[PDB]
Amino acid sequence: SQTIDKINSCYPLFEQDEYQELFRNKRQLEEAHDAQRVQEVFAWTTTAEYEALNFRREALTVDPAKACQPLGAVLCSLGFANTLPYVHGSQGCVAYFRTYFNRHFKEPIACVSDSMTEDAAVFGGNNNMNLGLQNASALYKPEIIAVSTTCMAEVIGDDLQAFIANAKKDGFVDSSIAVPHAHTPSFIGSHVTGWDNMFEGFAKTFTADYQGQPGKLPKLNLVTGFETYLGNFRVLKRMMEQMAVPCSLLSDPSEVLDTPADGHYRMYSGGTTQQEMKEAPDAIDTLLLQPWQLLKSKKVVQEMWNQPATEVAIPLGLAATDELLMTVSQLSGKPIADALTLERGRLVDMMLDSHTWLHGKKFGLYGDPDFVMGLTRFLLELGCEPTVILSHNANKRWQKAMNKMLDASPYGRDSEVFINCDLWHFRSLMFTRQPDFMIGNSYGKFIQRDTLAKGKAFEVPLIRLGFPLFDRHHLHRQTTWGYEGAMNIVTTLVNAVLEKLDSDTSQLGKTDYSFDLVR
Amino acid sequence: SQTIDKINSCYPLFEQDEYQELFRNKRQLEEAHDAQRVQEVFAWTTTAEYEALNFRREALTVDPAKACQPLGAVLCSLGFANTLPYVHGSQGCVAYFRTYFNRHFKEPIACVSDSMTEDAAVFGGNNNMNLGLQNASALYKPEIIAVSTTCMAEVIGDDLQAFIANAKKDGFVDSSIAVPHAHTPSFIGSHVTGWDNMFEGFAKTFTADYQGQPGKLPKLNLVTGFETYLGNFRVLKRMMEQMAVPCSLLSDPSEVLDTPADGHYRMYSGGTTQQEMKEAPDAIDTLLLQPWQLLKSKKVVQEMWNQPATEVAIPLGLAATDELLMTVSQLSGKPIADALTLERGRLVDMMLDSHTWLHGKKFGLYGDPDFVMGLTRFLLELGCEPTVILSHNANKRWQKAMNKMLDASPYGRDSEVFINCDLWHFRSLMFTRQPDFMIGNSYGKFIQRDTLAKGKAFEVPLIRLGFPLFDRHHLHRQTTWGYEGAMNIVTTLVNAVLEKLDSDTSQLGKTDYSFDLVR
Amino acid sequence: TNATGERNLALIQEVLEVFPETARKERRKHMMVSDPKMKSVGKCIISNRKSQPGVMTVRGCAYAGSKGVVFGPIKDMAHISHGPVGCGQYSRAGRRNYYTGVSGVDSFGTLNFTSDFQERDIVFGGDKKLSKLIEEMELLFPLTKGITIQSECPVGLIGDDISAVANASSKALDKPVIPVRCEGFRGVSQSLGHHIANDVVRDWILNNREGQPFETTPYDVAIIGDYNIGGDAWASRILLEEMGLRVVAQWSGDGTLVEMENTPFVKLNLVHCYRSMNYIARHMEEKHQIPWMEYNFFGPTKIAESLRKIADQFDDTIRANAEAVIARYEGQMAAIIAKYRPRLEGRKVLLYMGGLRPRHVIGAYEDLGMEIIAAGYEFAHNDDYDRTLPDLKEGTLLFDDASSYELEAFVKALKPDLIGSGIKEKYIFQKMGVPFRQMHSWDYSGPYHGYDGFAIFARDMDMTLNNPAWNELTAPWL
Amino acid sequence: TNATGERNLALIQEVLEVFPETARKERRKHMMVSDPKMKSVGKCIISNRKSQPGVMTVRGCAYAGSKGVVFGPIKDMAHISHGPVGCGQYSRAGRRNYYTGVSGVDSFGTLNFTSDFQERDIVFGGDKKLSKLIEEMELLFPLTKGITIQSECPVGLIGDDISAVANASSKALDKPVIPVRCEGFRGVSQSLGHHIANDVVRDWILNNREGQPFETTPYDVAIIGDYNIGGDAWASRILLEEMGLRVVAQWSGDGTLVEMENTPFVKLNLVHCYRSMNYIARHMEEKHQIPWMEYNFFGPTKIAESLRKIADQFDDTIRANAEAVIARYEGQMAAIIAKYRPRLEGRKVLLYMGGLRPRHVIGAYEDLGMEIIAAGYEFAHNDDYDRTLPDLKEGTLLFDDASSYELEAFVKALKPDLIGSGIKEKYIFQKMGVPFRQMHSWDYSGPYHGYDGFAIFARDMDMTLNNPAWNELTAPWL
Numbered sequence A, B: 001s002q003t004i005d006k007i008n009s010c011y012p013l014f015e016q017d018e019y020q021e022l023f024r025n026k027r028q029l030e031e032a033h034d035a036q037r038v039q040e041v042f043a044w045t046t047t048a049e050y051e052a053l054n055f056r057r058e059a060l061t062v063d064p065a066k067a068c069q070p071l072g073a074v075l076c077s078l079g080f081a082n083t084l085p086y087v088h089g090s091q092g093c094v095a096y097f098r099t100y101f102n103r104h105f106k107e108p109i110a111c112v113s114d115s116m117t118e119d120a121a122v123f124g125g126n127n128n129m130n131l132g133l134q135n136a137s138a139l140y141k142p143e144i145i146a147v148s149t150t151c152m153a154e155v156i157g158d159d160l161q162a163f164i165a166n167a168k169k170d171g172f173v174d175s176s177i178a179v180p181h182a183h184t185p186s187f188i189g190s191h192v193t194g195w196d197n198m199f200e201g202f203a204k205t206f207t208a209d210y211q212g213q214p215g216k217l218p219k220l221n222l223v224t225g226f227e228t229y230l231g232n233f234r235v236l237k238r239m240m241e242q243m244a245v246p247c248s249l250l251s252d253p254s255e256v257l258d259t260p261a262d263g264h265y266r267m268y269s270g271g272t273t274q275q276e277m278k279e280a281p282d283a284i285d286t287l288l289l290q291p292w293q294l295l296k297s298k299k300v301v302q303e304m305w306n307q308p309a310t311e312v313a314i315p316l317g318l319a320a321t322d323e324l325l326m327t328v329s330q331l332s333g334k335p336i337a338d339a340l341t342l343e344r345g346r347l348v349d350m351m352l353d354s355h356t357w358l359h360g361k362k363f364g365l366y367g368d369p370d371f372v373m374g375l376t377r378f379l380l381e382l383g384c385e386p387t388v389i390l391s392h393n394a395n396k397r398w399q400k401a402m403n404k405m406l407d408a409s410p411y412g413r414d415s416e417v418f419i420n421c422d423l424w425h426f427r428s429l430m431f432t433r434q435p436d437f438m439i440g441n442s443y444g445k446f447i448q449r450d451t452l453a454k455g456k457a458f459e460v461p462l463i464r465l466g467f468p469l470f471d472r473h474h475l476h477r478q479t480t481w482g483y484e485g486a487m488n489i490v491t492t493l494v495n496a497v498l499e500k501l502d503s504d505t506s507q508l509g510k511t512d513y514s515f516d517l518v519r
Numbered sequence C, D: 001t002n003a004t005g006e007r008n009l010a011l012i013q014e015v016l017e018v019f020p021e022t023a024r025k026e027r028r029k030h031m032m033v034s035d036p037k038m039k040s041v042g043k044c045i046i047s048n049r050k051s052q053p054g055v056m057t058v059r060g061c062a063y064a065g066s067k068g069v070v071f072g073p074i075k076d077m078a079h080i081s082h083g084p085v086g087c088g089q090y091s092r093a094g095r096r097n098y099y100t101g102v103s104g105v106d107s108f109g110t111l112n113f114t115s116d117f118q119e120r121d122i123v124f125g126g127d128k129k130l131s132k133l134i135e136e137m138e139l140l141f142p143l144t145k146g147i148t149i150q151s152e153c154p155v156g157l158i159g160d161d162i163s164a165v166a167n168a169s170s171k172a173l174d175k176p177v178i179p180v181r182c183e184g185f186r187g188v189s190q191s192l193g194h195h196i197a198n199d200v201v202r203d204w205i206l207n208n209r210e211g212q213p214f215e216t217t218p219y220d221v222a223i224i225g226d227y228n229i230g231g232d233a234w235a236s237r238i239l240l241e242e243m244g245l246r247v248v249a250q251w252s253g254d255g256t257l258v259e260m261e262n263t264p265f266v267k268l269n270l271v272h273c274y275r276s277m278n279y280i281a282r283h284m285e286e287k288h289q290i291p292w293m294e295y296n297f298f299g300p301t302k303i304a305e306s307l308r309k310i311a312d313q314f315d316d317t318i319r320a321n322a323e324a325v326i327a328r329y330e331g332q333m334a335a336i337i338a339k340y341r342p343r344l345e346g347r348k349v350l351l352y353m354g355g356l357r358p359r360h361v362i363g364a365y366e367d368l369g370m371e372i373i374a375a376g377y378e379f380a381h382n383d384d385y386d387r388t389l390p391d392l393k394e395g396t397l398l399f400d401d402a403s404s405y406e407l408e409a410f411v412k413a414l415k416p417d418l419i420g421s422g423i424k425e426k427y428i429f430q431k432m433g434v435p436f437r438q439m440h441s442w443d444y445s446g447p448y449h450g451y452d453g454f455a456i457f458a459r460d461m462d463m464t465l466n467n468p469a470w471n472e473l474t475a476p477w478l
């Protein structure tokens, strides 16, 4: 039932008596396990015995914390001006890539497929490539069609390069359109590998025949890798302008993922121009800001462009931002701006003001390898203990580097690092290691719910930092790099601690002796 | 007891068995009312019967939502360069003003007293003024000593103007130091009245005999009134720079309330200069951005400076920011910048993306009169219903304007406005009118607690927007004005809705049918 | 045709002008203007054909249709996304097919199980990994009633044999282990995944209880083709039970393997989504002699028609009950219409969804005085366009498998007051200034089926069409 | 003196060189360097004087001392801040004087009750408004045990007579209604508020149950002067009850009017804060023949000394119990010293707080190996300076009523490793790069009293002194 005065949606409609009755009656037709048995298995899933069995898995993955290569090629492609992402292969993949980004950014996402079907399995997909480039050019008028692949195209062995050379030869794609490409097999690596593979394709198309001279242009290029916070692209440009050092981001989707709602749909907006990519070899250097995933991009910088590829850490936190600005200052010969020194001191004031609530707190965290290394480093710099550190798509070389960092910190003595493990593994770790909080993406909400069902004392609250963020709005606008991003991370962490403490101390007449007005 | 590996602070130490037994034993020595009588009285305090008795109050105030005049004068004074706030009267006041701002801003607050004691009701406070000005000058070396008053001083009737002239003539304070003053009786109005009174004093000191000519400088002055978000001073300057319209803020404490932790304590930083205040009558006009409180400031602008004092609404929300920029454009003759139109469109895109969670949501809200009118306006503009609106320090002219705006809107049909009512009134209203959420300052946490103790179904969660904010850190850095501030308010409101819906749907096997990943 | 029809045929010619000739000629046969006297589309439109390469079709794949739509909702079974990691991650908890249960313990719909193929699985094959996976699943998830294996693109391409694995594991586990060859390259859209899934249900589930005792009632029914989006199937089931029927099974929203196995014992199959589950309804009629009928629970006109027709398949007691239920909710219905119809009447709507809703929600819109000016489907077949014709006003634009380009061009010309479509369409049309409601996920609201659902539907169309922000797209100085 | 004493005397002359001559002369009598041979300060220091005008004293007022410190913590009475709105708002829930109860119903410490004076109250007087306010209070807060009236500045200046109102209202309500003339212009600091409040308790509360039966034990005590900051008095009361004593009253942290009225029946008064409550302990010895003794529950050295001296006032059974309680907590204490002393020893501390803690916490710092290089008080009297001399190393800087200029200059010259002071001092010294702990509010931690409090105190000094951020105030390029 409903009333005209107070219509209820699904929740809490289904809390009403008639629906609880409906549910009791439907239960009797399901041959449900009795509630005692379900309770008993739930409890057993929270134990150390179940954890050991869980960590013996070698074939089953449950609740992965990674996606597949072509998602990352699509995101890299969206960062170039007037570029239409195009994934050669089967169309179901493109419906899912667009949807996945639509739900994080709350924005439209342009991307096409060439719709290979069973016919293309024996003939190969060269007819789909010819018609697809022809139709996409006509409908969408891109200056660049950036082509990646789905797993059907990789398994059948479609010769991408040849297909595109044939489309050009035979008049299906005009000479005015650039068609960079990359092979992006979903059964190798993850979405971050797809981004790096796509970037190498752009580099070949736009610079392979160019005779560059490092420092001919007194600028730095910056390469972000797979990054889904709009604020991170923007803060880098802002700091470089304050430094007075010319710069170009190579792949910057922040304008096309934030177009105004003014009565017009703009499929293309901003992005790295062809001029910026073509003149990239003349910069002083190219700084690869997520170094663990930008592996082919480092070979571009050093072997194609003969630039230093000066090593930099992800610019997350106070010390890693100081190291990025010192590197920009050394390479350019320009001093660090007084406005940046002022911003740095305000971040340090914030760290000193909030330190008593953060020191000694225990965190679990998961995400992509470069993000997890940077966030673990900043938590150690805050005096926090990152006790459970998981990266499903990280490798053994990254794990060794993380353990070297942790061993050298007083705050890393109880830390455990997990690679090639998933969020069902992370769930057991939240039950057995019980950190105060866990930092993750929206998939972590189910782990918070499961820990709460063991009891209020066992709840591990989620703090949302990462991708995807689907159950809160406009967090993709935020910044996590630079001093500005560090201010957002410190504010987020201390107010998560204070929100949980108020909740714990908000029981009238019981725990509200410590429901303090001032904290 | 305590274990060495896990030391518990107050909460949750006192939850341990030995302390629960201690509390039972102490309770036997208090002649405590019986538990059933206490529950009966608590339940009665949540009723409409109790509410009717509560609204019969004429003499008792409980949990006021306002402070006294000198607090506002101190904040005004802090926004001028090299200024030391000085409150003529009794010293306990100054310890409290400093402490109150310390806990909101997490920053030092310079302010002195002249420590008037008992003898001053027979002799007057002239000796204290002479010695106080002399000692403050020698220790703190201000350029400007900005004098206000405590209630002792006002009751005694000390003649500030004559004391200050006597100090200068007798050599207690150098003639080069500016010593603006204002009478700030705590028994008239509130802290926003003290701010406006102090501004009038700075205007007399720096401009009384000046022959100004509006438009001699092609600039606009801006006056914020009592405002405790650093981002609002900053966003006004940023928008004016984008407009390419020269501007001064008259009273800007955003640098002295955000000095860096760099090994040095700076008691003075930034602020309106003497040159900006002395040349203020030559601007095109002065825009008073919180019009209900800036009453004597409007008389300055019009009667002393012979400027229009172009009426502007508080620049909170989309429409009110549009109106500010159209007024800046009309007075200056310069076009609205394309970067500001882009920012506006992104705000509208956020509002369209988040509208299904905010439409029809019911809010209670309280705070100072200008802020409450502005935030009520924007909530109507979002399609929300501000059902309970309270401003303890507002007057009947403001209440009439508020009911006029509400009556005209589709979303104001169930809105009730209360003036000269406090947070014990507001607490009854949360029980009887039960809005979805309440927007307030940290004192609202007690009302949230009280409503939860009636039951989880009755809890009205607090959204912190206002002053003071003592129980979360670094919210004072935020912005609430302009399109940037509206982005913050929109994101804040929609994520409060989503956090509460997740909490309500997070009970494993019971309400989690609607614990959606994607919202 | 009428003046509206002529304007729409001229719009069709203009929109297709941009297409290269080969595509242009093909695409022309996927659109038409309706004629109220027509009872069949005939050769007037063609559908369920390949998409045109490179045009930004809205469609998905057969894995979406099998895993995402038909099997994914069954709460008491673990569904394995078998292949590389992408498909199961993008489809994890994207569709609001509600259920109740204890996640990870007796109900598994929000977990993402996968065999996360790596290069060695492509080179050497995945059957050994799959068998080991199922052992590990039975160890860690002992309360599953059965297990499904949803194939992704690589599995058939490398020559794996999941049917042999399913048979061996079902014997070892002593539970149904169901192999599905729903690779995304098969067919042309989500549709072939439905049909593959119905055929798998036919052979691997539906005969499991044959010859077993089952306590029947004269009024036993099944809800066939309701995936409980936002609780839609619960809001329908309550009405059927209030009328005196026993809903033995719901396919597949909040559904179980047990309910599906008991379905050959009912008296009547009630099909809501004709597209996805007509296949198994026709199979049960042939094999088990169970009649089936299509019904529509969107809005009071359709609900009253459906309750009366369902009841007419039984006896005078259920016919009387159908009238009593309608009379019980008449007050609620007249209050909803009286409040919201005035805020919505005369406004024009464009609809673009999968295989059912573009025609199925028209009566609810008409109940609030709204008018449908264009309707299209991603992957419907010609028998669905046939079924759409009775509910369209003369001259309406009716179209199939539209590109992004075509939908944008239709919207710019027709200027609908409201659009109902999916998540990849939402943020495009909001920036163009057109009120938009997601009509797959219900924009995180619902239910919209049943009497309780109509109130939510009306509230939501008013909320979005009349929101104040739609007057602010253009800055006031412009 | 020694080399430290010499430097500190030189530092004193340098610092006061900024003051105008009238203040300068005066300020030199408020600082000294300690001598271990000295028992009393004699003429070496003066204190409890008016502050100098305009120097930024840390001091508050007599209303802070009466309402904020002594009466505000009493949970079963309603305390009215009588005058304009400022005083009660700035002091609403600023001091963490913990209590248990149901807010607004049987306990009232976090509500701010005020008469909110307006200009008409200044002009015609506030006594009629106060009588009316008390009637409304009793209607809306029926479970108060009693009510106090805390005068703000204007009340005595406009000639009001709150004792006449208190007498009439106490007869009207049949509850104690207690007038307090604690206007902030009285006295020189918080101190006179303490004294005023002790005299009011002497006259209006302590005699209320005189002559009445009360069941006593031989081991009945009261805790006098512990305001339960962060639960400090609970962490103290547990040890006294473990030792076999019955704590009949706690003044006034988590305290009640009832406990105060029963205090004249105890056997022994245990004074923690001497400054704020010595007055009433001396009165109870003279009028009721109840002995009193000062004690100190900061850190293991002082706790054991205190437990043994308290038990020595009773008999051999309580003396043996003192040894058993000390033994019971000795493993906890040895583990705290082993973990934290190595992380803190050798480091130097500067203390600046009100009237007790600047000397009282020195033992606990010394148990963790730290050294106090300078200690000062806002408003202490010379008998508190006398009491500080036994716990200072030779040539320590000891000072009174410092301006912010003077604290800053002492910190810059002395360069302590850690500072303990208040909220107005915290954010200045953190910007100067000196680790800082609030030693009034415990920086939102505590308790610090007792055996359970020493663990927290050690954790907190290590957390802040050794935090990694203190190495980052200078940019690495500077």
Ligand code: CFM
Binding pocket: C065, C069, C095, C190, C227, C229, C273, C274, C275, C276, C353, C354, C355, C356, C357, C358, C439, C440, C441
């Ligand atoms: S797009 Fe239904 S034939 Fe299928 S997921 Fe939506 S219009 Fe599907 S009604 Fe259904 S619950 Fe659907 S909304 Fe038939 S199930 S492949 Mo996208």
Ligand code: CFM
Binding pocket: D065, D069, D095, D190, D227, D229, D273, D274, D275, D276, D353, D354, D355, D356, D357, D358, D439, D440, D441
């Ligand atoms: S500054 Fe105590 S004489 Fe008094 S509020 Fe703190 S050093 Fe007071 S110990 Fe006490 S609980 Fe205090 S910490 Fe005596 S009560 S006027 Mo500010």
Ligand code: CLF
Binding pocket: A068, A069, A070, A090, A091, A092, A093, A094, A096, A149, A150, A151, A152, A186, C061, C062, C063, C064, C083, C084, C085, C086, C087, C151, C152, C153, C182, C183, C184, C185
């Ligand atoms: S059409 Fe459909 S969704 Fe596409 S792959 Fe095929 S079954 Fe699957 Fe999968 S892992 Fe990523 S998303 Fe694709 S490239 Fe392969």
Ligand SMILES: [Cl-]
Binding pocket: A292, A293, A369, A393, A394, A395, A398
């Ligand atoms: Cl890696």
Ligand SMILES: [Cl-]
Binding pocket: B292, B293, B369, B393, B394, B395, B398
């Ligand atoms: Cl007002």
Ligand SMILES: [Mg+2]
Binding pocket: A105, A106, A107, B349, B350, B353, C427
């Ligand atoms: Mg958007």
Ligand SMILES: [Mg+2]
Binding pocket: A349, A350, A353, B105, B106, B107, D427
């Ligand atoms: Mg600070």
Ligand SMILES: [Mg+2]
Binding pocket: B027, B032, D100, D101, D102
């Ligand atoms: Mg109690």
